[PDB]
Design an enzyme around this catalytic site. Structure first.
Site, PDB file in Angstrom:
ATOM      1  N   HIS A   1       1.972  26.818  80.076  1.00 17.53           N
ATOM      2  CA  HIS A   1       0.619  26.248  80.000  1.00 17.53           C
ATOM      3  C   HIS A   1      -0.362  27.031  80.910  1.00 17.53           C
ATOM      4  O   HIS A   1      -0.429  26.806  82.114  1.00 17.53           O
ATOM      5  CB  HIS A   1       0.648  24.783  80.417  1.00 17.53           C
ATOM      6  CG  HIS A   1      -0.647  24.055  80.222  1.00 17.53           C
ATOM      7  ND1 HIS A   1      -0.684  22.779  79.709  1.00 17.53           N
ATOM      8  CD2 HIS A   1      -1.936  24.407  80.450  1.00 17.53           C
ATOM      9  CE1 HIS A   1      -1.938  22.377  79.628  1.00 17.53           C
ATOM     10  NE2 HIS A   1      -2.715  23.342  80.087  1.00 17.53           N
TER      11      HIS A   1
ATOM     12  N   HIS B   1      -4.409  29.005  81.302  1.00 18.05           N
ATOM     13  CA  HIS B   1      -5.765  29.363  80.872  1.00 18.05           C
ATOM     14  C   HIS B   1      -6.086  30.747  81.396  1.00 18.05           C
ATOM     15  O   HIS B   1      -6.051  30.964  82.603  1.00 18.05           O
ATOM     16  CB  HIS B   1      -6.786  28.346  81.371  1.00 18.05           C
ATOM     17  CG  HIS B   1      -6.544  26.986  80.830  1.00 18.05           C
ATOM     18  ND1 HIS B   1      -7.066  26.560  79.625  1.00 18.05           N
ATOM     19  CD2 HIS B   1      -5.785  25.971  81.299  1.00 18.05           C
ATOM     20  CE1 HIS B   1      -6.615  25.344  79.371  1.00 18.05           C
ATOM     21  NE2 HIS B   1      -5.858  24.951  80.380  1.00 18.05           N
ATOM     22  N   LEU B   2      -6.409  31.670  80.484  1.00 15.26           N
ATOM     23  CA  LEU B   2      -6.770  33.046  80.862  1.00 15.26           C
ATOM     24  C   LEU B   2      -8.255  33.367  80.737  1.00 15.26           C
ATOM     25  O   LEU B   2      -8.693  34.442  81.148  1.00 15.26           O
ATOM     26  CB  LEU B   2      -5.952  34.034  80.023  1.00 15.26           C
ATOM     27  CG  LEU B   2      -4.462  34.170  80.365  1.00 15.26           C
ATOM     28  CD1 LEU B   2      -3.816  35.193  79.434  1.00 15.26           C
ATOM     29  CD2 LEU B   2      -4.249  34.554  81.829  1.00 15.26           C
ATOM     30  N   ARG B   3      -9.031  32.453  80.165  1.00 15.43           N
ATOM     31  CA  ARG B   3     -10.472  32.648  80.001  1.00 15.43           C
ATOM     32  C   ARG B   3     -10.725  33.889  79.151  1.00 15.43           C
ATOM     33  O   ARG B   3      -9.894  34.246  78.314  1.00 15.43           O
ATOM     34  CB  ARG B   3     -11.187  32.711  81.367  1.00 15.43           C
ATOM     35  CG  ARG B   3     -10.854  31.570  82.316  1.00 15.43           C
ATOM     36  CD  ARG B   3     -11.142  30.178  81.699  1.00 15.43           C
ATOM     37  NE  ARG B   3     -10.984  29.105  82.685  1.00 15.43           N
ATOM     38  CZ  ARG B   3     -10.659  27.843  82.411  1.00 15.43           C
ATOM     39  NH1 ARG B   3     -10.422  27.416  81.170  1.00 15.43           N
ATOM     40  NH2 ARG B   3     -10.552  27.001  83.412  1.00 15.43           N
TER      41      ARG B   3
ATOM     42  N   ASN C   1      -8.898  26.837  74.589  1.00 13.09           N
ATOM     43  CA  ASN C   1     -10.199  26.211  74.882  1.00 13.09           C
ATOM     44  C   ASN C   1     -11.256  27.188  75.439  1.00 13.09           C
ATOM     45  O   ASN C   1     -11.888  26.923  76.473  1.00 13.09           O
ATOM     46  CB  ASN C   1     -10.007  25.010  75.818  1.00 13.09           C
ATOM     47  CG  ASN C   1      -9.505  25.399  77.197  1.00 13.09           C
ATOM     48  OD1 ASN C   1      -8.803  26.402  77.363  1.00 13.09           O
ATOM     49  ND2 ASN C   1      -9.866  24.605  78.200  1.00 13.09           N
TER      50      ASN C   1
ATOM     51  N   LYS D   1      -2.752  22.951  70.043  1.00 14.26           N
ATOM     52  CA  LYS D   1      -3.112  22.161  71.228  1.00 14.26           C
ATOM     53  C   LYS D   1      -4.098  21.070  70.866  1.00 14.26           C
ATOM     54  O   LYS D   1      -5.134  21.330  70.223  1.00 14.26           O
ATOM     55  CB  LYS D   1      -3.685  23.067  72.300  1.00 14.26           C
ATOM     56  CG  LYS D   1      -4.162  22.350  73.594  1.00 14.26           C
ATOM     57  CD  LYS D   1      -2.998  21.698  74.372  1.00 14.26           C
ATOM     58  CE  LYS D   1      -3.451  21.083  75.725  1.00 14.26           C
ATOM     59  NZ  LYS D   1      -4.057  22.144  76.618  1.00 14.26           N
TER      60      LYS D   1
ATOM     61  N   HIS E   1      -2.819  17.270  75.501  1.00  7.67           N
ATOM     62  CA  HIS E   1      -3.511  16.806  76.702  1.00  7.67           C
ATOM     63  C   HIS E   1      -3.668  15.305  76.522  1.00  7.67           C
ATOM     64  O   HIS E   1      -4.554  14.828  75.776  1.00  7.67           O
ATOM     65  CB  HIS E   1      -4.874  17.469  76.883  1.00  7.67           C
ATOM     66  CG  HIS E   1      -5.596  16.976  78.100  1.00  7.67           C
ATOM     67  ND1 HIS E   1      -5.891  17.793  79.168  1.00  7.67           N
ATOM     68  CD2 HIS E   1      -6.024  15.738  78.441  1.00  7.67           C
ATOM     69  CE1 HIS E   1      -6.474  17.076  80.114  1.00  7.67           C
ATOM     70  NE2 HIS E   1      -6.574  15.828  79.697  1.00  7.67           N
TER      71      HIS E   1
ATOM     72  N   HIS F   1       1.125  18.860  81.341  1.00  4.61           N
ATOM     73  CA  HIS F   1       0.706  18.491  82.718  1.00  4.61           C
ATOM     74  C   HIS F   1       0.698  16.998  82.977  1.00  4.61           C
ATOM     75  O   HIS F   1      -0.371  16.403  83.173  1.00  4.61           O
ATOM     76  CB  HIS F   1      -0.637  19.103  83.069  1.00  4.61           C
ATOM     77  CG  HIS F   1      -1.733  18.894  82.055  1.00  4.61           C
ATOM     78  ND1 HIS F   1      -1.934  17.710  81.373  1.00  4.61           N
ATOM     79  CD2 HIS F   1      -2.747  19.711  81.682  1.00  4.61           C
ATOM     80  CE1 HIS F   1      -2.991  17.830  80.587  1.00  4.61           C
ATOM     81  NE2 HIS F   1      -3.511  19.028  80.773  1.00  4.61           N
TER      82      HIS F   1
ATOM     83  N   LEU G   1      -7.923  18.094  85.756  1.00  8.93           N
ATOM     84  CA  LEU G   1      -7.521  17.074  84.810  1.00  8.93           C
ATOM     85  C   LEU G   1      -6.111  17.346  84.324  1.00  8.93           C
ATOM     86  O   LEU G   1      -5.713  18.491  84.230  1.00  8.93           O
ATOM     87  CB  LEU G   1      -8.472  17.059  83.604  1.00  8.93           C
ATOM     88  CG  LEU G   1      -9.941  16.801  83.940  1.00  8.93           C
ATOM     89  CD1 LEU G   1     -10.786  16.877  82.683  1.00  8.93           C
ATOM     90  CD2 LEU G   1     -10.170  15.470  84.692  1.00  8.93           C
TER      91      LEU G   1
ATOM     92  N   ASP H   1      -0.871  25.252  84.342  1.00  2.00           N
ATOM     93  CA  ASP H   1      -2.275  24.934  84.029  1.00  2.00           C
ATOM     94  C   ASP H   1      -3.243  25.643  84.976  1.00  2.00           C
ATOM     95  O   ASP H   1      -4.297  25.084  85.381  1.00  2.00           O
ATOM     96  CB  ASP H   1      -2.515  23.420  83.995  1.00  2.00           C
ATOM     97  CG  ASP H   1      -3.818  23.032  83.277  1.00  2.00           C
ATOM     98  OD1 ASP H   1      -4.279  23.792  82.387  1.00  2.00           O
ATOM     99  OD2 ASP H   1      -4.330  21.939  83.585  1.00  2.00           O
TER     100      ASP H   1
ATOM    101  N   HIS I   1     -12.099  28.931  87.716  1.00  6.58           N
ATOM    102  CA  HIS I   1     -13.558  28.794  87.649  1.00  6.58           C
ATOM    103  C   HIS I   1     -14.121  29.514  88.836  1.00  6.58           C
ATOM    104  O   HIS I   1     -13.557  29.433  89.931  1.00  6.58           O
ATOM    105  CB  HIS I   1     -14.005  27.330  87.731  1.00  6.58           C
ATOM    106  CG  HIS I   1     -13.537  26.496  86.581  1.00  6.58           C
ATOM    107  ND1 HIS I   1     -14.167  26.509  85.356  1.00  6.58           N
ATOM    108  CD2 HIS I   1     -12.514  25.618  86.471  1.00  6.58           C
ATOM    109  CE1 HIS I   1     -13.540  25.688  84.539  1.00  6.58           C
ATOM    110  NE2 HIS I   1     -12.535  25.133  85.189  1.00  6.58           N
TER     111      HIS I   1
ATOM    112  N   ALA J   1     -13.416  21.073  86.567  1.00  6.80           N
ATOM    113  CA  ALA J   1     -12.017  20.751  86.738  1.00  6.80           C
ATOM    114  C   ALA J   1     -11.120  21.960  86.490  1.00  6.80           C
ATOM    115  O   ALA J   1     -11.253  22.633  85.458  1.00  6.80           O
ATOM    116  CB  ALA J   1     -11.631  19.651  85.788  1.00  6.80           C
TER     117      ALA J   1
HETATM  118  N1  LIG Z   1      -6.882  20.935  83.611  1.00  9.99           N
HETATM  119  C1  LIG Z   1      -8.090  21.254  84.041  1.00  9.99           C
HETATM  120  O1  LIG Z   1      -8.552  20.596  84.952  1.00  9.99           O
HETATM  121  N2  LIG Z   1      -8.813  22.236  83.481  1.00  9.99           N
HETATM  122  C2  LIG Z   1      -8.467  22.964  82.260  1.00  9.99           C
HETATM  123  C3  LIG Z   1      -8.404  21.996  81.059  1.00  9.99           C
HETATM  124  C4  LIG Z   1      -7.122  21.181  80.823  1.00  9.99           C
HETATM  125  O2  LIG Z   1      -5.891  21.550  81.043  1.00  9.99           O
HETATM  126  O3  LIG Z   1      -7.377  20.038  80.372  1.00  9.99           O
HETATM  127  C5  LIG Z   1      -9.527  24.034  82.008  1.00  9.99           C
HETATM  128  O4  LIG Z   1      -9.455  24.725  80.955  1.00  9.99           O
HETATM  129  O5  LIG Z   1     -10.470  24.219  82.855  1.00  9.99           O
HETATM  130 ZN   LIG Z   2      -5.168  19.692  79.733  1.00 13.20          ZN
HETATM  131 ZN   LIG Z   3      -4.779  23.240  80.459  1.00 13.40          ZN
END
Ligand SMILES: NC(=O)N[C@@H](CC(=O)O)C(=O)O
Ligand SMILES: [Zn+2]
Ligand SMILES: [Zn+2]
Ligand SMILES: O=C1C[C@@H](C(=O)O)NC(=O)N1
Ligand SMILES: [Zn+2]
Ligand SMILES: [Zn+2]
Lengths: 337, 343
Positions: free
Chosen positions: A13, A15-17, A41, A99, A130, A168, A213, A241, A245, A257
């Site tokens: 899980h 996020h690489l943006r 996302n 997802k 999620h 998560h 989150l 996760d 940011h 978040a």
């Molecule tokens: N978990 C988070 O707080 N942030 C994640 C989103 C996610 O996993 O819901 C994100 O993409 O910023």
């Molecule tokens: Zn999530």
């Molecule tokens: Zn996530």
């Protein structure tokens, strides 16, 4: 002194943006993990095979020479998504999973996407969830528990062959639910939800870098998650996760978040398992349980962690602003050799 | 547009800080309130008659020409505080009350209280002389969940203390829970409470859903909606031992919007209209004047103000920020359109 050799891990899980942030953050993952589940996302979200292919290449472009890293792409489920588009991406080896984000372009009901979910069930594509309800009247700390009862359990009863990862998890509610589930239900747990509870975010000051989150919960929930991983239960696995940011997007009147934990997650997990007297189960969590659930081979290389204290950088440079890593300025007890 | 005329209010719980910040923030209070309880948590804290006298004068220096504002000073209770010093400050009119912050065994004796049992001689003196005790009622033990700290205080400290010292007058400051609302509702004529505008208007969802909002981060922490509703119902009831205390607690923007944001809402500029909005929404405007202008005076044994101010139900925009000498202050409800404002 103490050295721990494990099969190379994966991150189920991540996020690489995109853009410059992608270029900055990918190496923290690619240097360690064989594979990662890359969440969809983006803005706009990855909802087509074509977008997923292009995103995968942008990721590969940013992977330093000599890192053997494979991004496993996902589809962002939407109410109107064509099941044929999802299936096609699966058949082409583009989508590893899909997802489900609760709306607040996310999914507004399970009922609206039933044909998509039925296709996933038929083809053997895992659904990553999620798991929070979002109605404005539901207290934020209750949203995960409420999801189990009102969405997850009816879903799993309706589509009994569907493979689901409860992403998560943050509650005893979810931990017990997963513990008592069948071989088609699994979960990921982040380092922050093992290491901390809501007190760490709110006592002595508000700490936005611990704001993520699903929200950090009460200590009793943290303890339930720690006991779950420590038990050796083999349907929980590593999913950071990592959700980066820019600093001043975190430190603002309305902080975003997400914890940027890719630099420190692996060692942080090692500390938890060690504290729980459960290092015998650590490799499986990091490197075996996920592959088994996803039906993918385990990695065939090995890495070593050593118990020597490294200080975490205060910040990481971006083109504009900085990135504040999880545990910035602090010490981590284990590091990768 | 509708007009609400009330006896000039007072603020029974206020942080005015010191130096340049004091100069900036005092006018937001002095233009409106006749009196305020000025809290003593300076760095270092106000723990002597001499410091309180000097602090009172710095506050008076910063009051704009023509504002009729009187600061009511407080003593910060500490382990090392001489009960003779507290009594003397009370007898001389310097200290109106004394403030008890959460106990901590590791606190320096010059800066706070290790345990309530350790300061019984000072609390007994307050009881003896009729000096009110203002309590920030939280237990701060590391193993207590932050949302539980107020309730735990009631059980562990407040009830035993009041059972021990039966004549002691106590204000349960800035109550945030149904636990505390019920406790105060069920208490005797020696127990009262203040409530802030943020704890009536918001609950923890407002601070955490859709983003983390450090300008709503304050102690005691915002609680779940059931607690907010209890607070609203208490003030709405006409119960006459609850009164206005803003807990206006200003911090520079950079200290709020940081990796470790300070606790406190700068609500002096918008508090009064906010309370009017709550009382109106609760169909309880007949109790609004008493809350703002009568109940506090009655509990403290002080006269009610004999001048009036008017709120008008006309929409206005709150400033986004308020300049300091360095940096800026973000007011409670910054940038929002508010329903009631002072004429
Ligand atoms: N978990 C988070 O707080 N942030 C994640 C989103 C996610 O996993 O819901 C994100 O993409 O910023
Ligand atoms: Zn999530
Ligand atoms: Zn996530
Ligand atoms: O108890 C307190 C202290 C106050 C302050 O900043 O002085 N701020 C708060 O939020 N509550
Ligand atoms: Zn307080
Ligand atoms: Zn205060």
């Amino acid at each position: 002194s103490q050295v721990l050799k494990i099969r190379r891990p994966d991150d189920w899980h991540l996020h690489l943006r995109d853009g410059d942030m992608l270029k900055t953050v990918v190496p923290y993952t690619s240097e360690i993990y064989g594979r990662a589940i890359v969440m969809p996302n983006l803005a706009p979200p990855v909802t087509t095979v074509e977008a997923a292919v292009a995103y995968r290449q942008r990721i590969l472009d940013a992977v330093p020479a000599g890192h053997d890293f494979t991004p496993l792409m996902t589809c962002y489920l939407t109410d109107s998504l064509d099941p044929n588009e999802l299936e096609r991406g699966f058949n082409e080896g583009v989508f590893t999973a899909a997802k489900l984000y609760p709306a607040n372009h996310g999914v507004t009901s399970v009922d609206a996407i039933m044909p998509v979910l039925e296709r996933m069930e038929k083809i053997g594509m895992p659904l990553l969830v999620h798991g929070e309800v979002t109605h404005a009247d539901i207290d934020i700390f209750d949203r995960e528990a409420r999801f189990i009862e009102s969405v997850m359990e009816p879903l799993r009863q309706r589509l009994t062959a569907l493979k689901v990862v409860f992403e998560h998890i943050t509650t005893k509610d979810a931990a017990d639910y997963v513990r008592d589930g069948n071989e088609r239900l699994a979960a990921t747990i982040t380092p922050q939800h093992l290491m901390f509870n809501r007190n760490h975010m709110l006592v002595g000051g508000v700490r936005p870098h611990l704001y993520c989150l699903p929200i950090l919960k009460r200590n009793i929930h943290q303890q339930a998650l720690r006991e779950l991983v420590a038990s050796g239960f083999n349907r929980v696995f590593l999913g950071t996760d990592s959700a980066p940011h820019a600093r001043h997007r975190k430190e603002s009147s309305c902080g975003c978040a997400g914890c940027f934990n890719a630099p420190t997650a692996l060692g942080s997990y090692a500390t938890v398992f060690e504290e729980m007297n459960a290092l015998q189960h650590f490799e499986a969590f990091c490197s075996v349980n996920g592959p088994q659930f996803y039906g993918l081979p385990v990695n065939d290389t090995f890495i070593e962690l050593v118990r020597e204290e490294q200080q975490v950088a205060e910040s990481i440079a971006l083109t504009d602003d900085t990135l504040v890593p999880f545990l910035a300025g602090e010490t981590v007890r284990w590091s990768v050799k």
